[PDB]
Design a protein around this ligand. Sequence first.
Ligand SMILES: O=C(Nc1ccc(C(=O)N[C@H]2c3cccc(O)c3C[C@@H]2C(=O)O)cc1)NC1CC1
Length: 167
Amino acid sequence: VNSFSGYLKLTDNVYIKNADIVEEAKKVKPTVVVNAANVYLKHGGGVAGALNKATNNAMQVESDDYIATNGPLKVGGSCVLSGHNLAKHCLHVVGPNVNKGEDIQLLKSAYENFNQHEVLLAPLLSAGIFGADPIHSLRVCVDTVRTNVYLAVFDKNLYDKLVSSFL
Ligand SMILES: O=C(Nc1ccc(C(=O)N[C@H]2c3cccc(O)c3C[C@@H]2C(=O)O)cc1)NC1CC1
């Protein structure tokens, strides 16, 4: 049993809710919240910008030190950093950004990072300002992630479309 509330069950292991991932993280304090990161961990907008704002920029400060030491992530890769006031840990995962021409096949590799964590709160990777089709992202999620994932979809119209079109 876990504290995630109001989710629709899509499969054995994937759950979905119309919710602001920031507000959901603040309320559940999950072990892992996933950030929709870029390779530079520059949390300017979209989900990343929102999560970072909720940490009063502490996520960005920590991220800048990480990059200065380790260099950029790979598209499809991830790193575990602090969850600050939102979660125990933040898994920063880089999905391909279609508005940069990145290969959409890398989306499966990005979701594979979730399998290193038993339970996660997450957005749909490569959705929103990353330019991919969220219906496709949900399909890849379901077909790749085997651990227990609680997906937060900010837009109600999109949430309803994702549920109603789910096979
Ligand atoms: O701003 C906020 N929350 C806030 C929450 C989510 C987003 C956002 O863009 N999410 C989408 C995104 C962005 C980038 C890549 C992606 O794959 C996705 C899928 C995500 C989705 O479809 O849900 C933006 C803002 N809270 C403050 C207190 C009011």
